[model samples]
Target chain A: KEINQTRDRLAKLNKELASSEQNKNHINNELKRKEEQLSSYEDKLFDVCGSQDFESDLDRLKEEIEKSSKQRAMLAGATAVYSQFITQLTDENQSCCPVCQRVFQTEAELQEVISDLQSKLRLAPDKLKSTESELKKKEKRRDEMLGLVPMRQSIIDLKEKEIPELRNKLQNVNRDIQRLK
Target chain B: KEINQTRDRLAKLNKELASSEQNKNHINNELKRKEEQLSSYEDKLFDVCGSQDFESDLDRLKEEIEKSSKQRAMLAGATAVYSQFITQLTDENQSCCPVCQRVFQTEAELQEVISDLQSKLRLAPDKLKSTESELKKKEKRRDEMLGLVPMRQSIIDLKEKEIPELRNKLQNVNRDIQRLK
Candidate 1:
């Protein structure tokens, strides 16, 4: 009775679980298929995501850097205009007391404007440098996301292939049983 | 779409098929399971099914040969009795009978008895020969069944060993995977 019961259970499992010859075969096949798919996906991911710098981010950073430089140049040019205006005003008034008045009748005002412009010009190059660094950081983040795509692609490929291969092997085994007739 | 449909159908069929490896494994496992049943009720069934050797048909043929020898002895004893009786009659009737008639009676009657005994003796040997031949055929059949037993045993042994080994290997692989995790 025990034997019979166990046999019945085995039979049921054989019928229901991957107990069928076909199911085992399918599983085996799926495993192979998954491996192959993973290989392909891994290859593709490597092609696309491998960090050998497809430099689009670098180029964008370069463009931003150029724009920052251009802005800095414009600020410097503005400062030069203020410097010329102040020089002209000072030459005109001999600047009553260029240091003490703290009041500019347009002439001293021009001197104050010149001082502010010189300060901004001194900082403009630094701003460009900081902007270049920020752009590099953004590119680095994009590169990180790109890196994960390939690895994930490989995993998905493996899953897709693995399932089918296993199923195929399982089916093949079932066919063999049917052939027994 | 058509290609996918065809592929799907093919896949379905493949899923229903059995692989050679699976059949090989299954048959091997079955043989192993049967082997484990050796010391059980199945052993008794093997005996009941007439698989266990009894005296075999050779013993029967030997008994038949013995019976034939007994029949031959009986025929010889009857001939001896008839000879003794004839001799006594010849001694008593010697004075009354003509020579030719006496010779004729003695010779013809003894010939007739001898002829009957000869035919009966022939039947016993022929019957024994038939029984012996039958015994040979039966022994041959018994030997064939005996031969089959070992083949089945070998097959069972292979399967018996295989299931454990395969299962163990599969388990080990799983363990390796776990360790990697």
Candidate 2:
């Protein structure tokens, strides 16, 4: 009789162990799946914005980029006016000015001043061309910043959306099953 | 009477057990289906580099968004100077090359750069506007690359293609605003 009882006990333990193994397998599979999802999301996010090395450089880079373009535009404008002045000095030779048409004492004297103005105008635009170099630096930083933003947000979203809630549900199911057992 | 009562109890217990078993089967089926669907979603999101077939596409899209903004900023600078130069050119006395006593030979050269500096420095924004528009088109292409849907196996739709094109248009508008300024 004792031998029969021992055999029954062993059979019950084996059944329980199988059930537990099944649960463990399910949990392991689920966990692996979730981790893979999280990792891929993070990788893409890093590729976009976080490649930049510096922490404080982004805003400065933005400013520098904006300033350079503005300077370039200003230079372009100044160069145009300077070029026109050249045409006027050489062609119409309007000394006083076309709008006002007030005469200068001598065309040579007027040309001298206009010529000086033209040279100075060209100087300002030259300084502004540095924006091109500045733009390159900012682009590098921009790419870096892009790397850090997205994946982090997606990970947070996943944590909030998937894991904890499902874990709670699983716990409840296990508790009910234990009571039945 | 006690034996009969015990027999009745067994019958009721059996009925309850049958119902419980049915409920367990139903729950198991539902859980399996949910798990399968989730598995499919996880599998689809495995890659992050390409815009399609990965959850990381969103990350890529965000990066593209930031990049387009920077490009617009550059366009803004170019436009602003163009406008100012256009305005100044109206003065009819704006052309005066100080570098050499020669006046601007052509209207095209007037808008562009001419002096001893970088060759690119003298580009006329007016003519370059077409090139800028072409770049905006490419930016839209980048947006498409960033916003691709990788999950579906079918050919890409015109609708999908239009989305990135429209989005990059916002940056183009930003460029316009800057030019107007």
Candidate 3:
């Protein structure tokens, strides 16, 4: 009777051990996943966010926009002044030009310069428009990169800190289980 | 007038770019958040379902239960036969037992064997009950592990294939954006 009971107890212990072993396996699987995910996120975040220089790129784009904006404003001002000069030069009663303070050599000379100024005025607007468009594109890209930085940082934080902490906890559980066994 | 019109177009392009850049940033943030969520899920799935020898452990437990069940059944059979023999020995007033074909030297000797059989009979029921209870526990655990396997497998599918596929798409978008730059 005693031997049978002892055997039964041994069987009971085996059953309990099997159950605990399954639990240990479940926890181990969980730990592996956490580690895998940490690696994956770390690699992706590095590939996408870590390779580039956002701050300098944003600064360069903003500087380009600033310089081009000034250029556009200068071109608009030149066009305005050139248009006013052309109108005054062609005015029948005007005796002298305000820009050079000189009287016209002939009607042909005045018309020639007037036409040349007219073309310059037209060219300024087109150049200004195209440059502004390019600046717009650059600024847009810079802003997009700016927004991506914080998100990448957050993911990095998860990888560097939060994930490791979780891994440690899982290891602790494993050690405790081992001791129990 | 031309310069003014050009300036107006530039302003319009700036507005459009700003709006579209904002939209792009919103989408990028949404993508980042989704990626983060996918990583979180992948990690959990890996931890729960990724590593182990579930099949073999389950098989071993099942085999143990089968063996123990047979043992309990054999013990029960022995107990039943012993009980009937004890009952018959007490019922008959014959001096000799049928199986042994030997006359009892004394009434005390016959009683001694009857008492021994009674003790053997009494031991079986308790062993059977304890063994059955142990078997019940093992069966419960086996069933629990069986049920968990499917859930663990689905999570592995997501981590190994599904989530990685989605992550690749995100990387593809990143590559396209880089090329555009």
Candidate 4:
């Protein structure tokens, strides 16, 4: 009374509690609408894909896959053919080529051919493995752009992060008001 | 001093002001990060599509367009062919069949054929127009799934709605604090 500050602490906290509840409820309502939207989008498998011409790129992928498959077939064919050719060698120093019909006269020449073919055959599986890896990426890209995935980081930001954080803030103010009470 | 509460409202207000500023700045930092992630995703034309299998549905659209387009072509062909046939008819009550090669025996039969063909051709443009409109929807679906569009409602919710809302809350608390000074 002497200070003439007629607003006492308890009365001030009462007004703040009402308004603080109002603000919290306001955010609470907004959060409700956001959660509803979040379900609608996420339920429909809303997702993001790389920014590219999916159609044209799909067409390109189609050809690339076909061409790559053809290459793999050829590689397998050559590897097996060369493998048999090396295995069927009757002499230690010389071998005859069945595909080209070449008769080797020198062991050095034959060894060169054998080593080259063996190396190609040895590397064939690794090359095929790389091709397999490449195809997996293409498949991933295919499914990625197909729109079957679900996502949305922003909704999570509010739902999991901001919403809870705001709740904490509201609790703080309510606690402050309660302490005065 | 007379109340013996020991903590005056002025000092409390000053402390709240400091902390209020802290909260506001805290939100300000979070908002910056949200904006950055928003641009990173949205800049690459991130978008959402229907949950249905985009690839299978795309294949379906592809066939539907081609078939609809084919139907349009056939309609045009028959319309023109019948138009020429009707114009070249010399008799008033009788017409020869170029397609089935059956000569008309009565004016009723000939009238039946004429009306049927005329009605078909008359509605042909409309049918083709429907096909065109269908193709348009198909094209929209195509480009939509092609991953060249931009969107994101959640970021906008925070950036446009919640951020400003929190700012307003901050101002209200700051104004309350300032009244003490």
Among the numbered candidates, top TM-score falls to 2
Candidate 3 lDDT score relative to the true structure: 0.61
Q: How far is each candidate from the true structure, as Cα RMSD in Å? A: 60.7, 17.0, 54.0, 23.1
Model 1 chain A: which ten-residue window has the lowest total lDDT? A95-104
Q: What is the Cα-based lDDT of residue B129 in candidate 1? A: 52
Instruction: Estimate, for each residue in A99-165, the C-alpha lDDT of model 2 and write its tens digit.
Output: 2233566767677767676666666554656666776677665545534433444577666877666
- Cα lDDT tens digits, model 2, B85-117, are 444544447664323334556766554532222
What's candidate 3's DockQ score?
0.00
- The ten-residue window of minimal lDDT in model 4 chain B covers B146-155
TM-score of chain B of each: 0.32, 0.34, 0.58, 0.39
Error of 3 at A147 (Å): 47
TM-score versus the correct structure, for each prediction: 0.24, 0.41, 0.34, 0.32
Summarize candidate 4's per-residue lDDT along A1-181 as a digit string, tens digits.
8454556765776887788777767766766776676676554443333334546665776677556645554555455555666775534333654323345557675666666657667777677568657755664455444433224455567678876776677677667657655
- CAPRI grade of model 2: incorrect
- Candidate 1 at residue B132, lDDT? 45
Please give the range of 10 consecutive residues that has the lowest summed lDDT in model 2 chain B: B150-159
Q: Candidates 1 and 4: which is better by DockQ?
A: 4
- Candidate 4, residues B7-59: lDDT per residue as tens digits? 56657767877887777677667767766766765544434445234446656
Interface RMSD for every prediction, one decimal? 71.5, 9.1, 53.7, 22.9
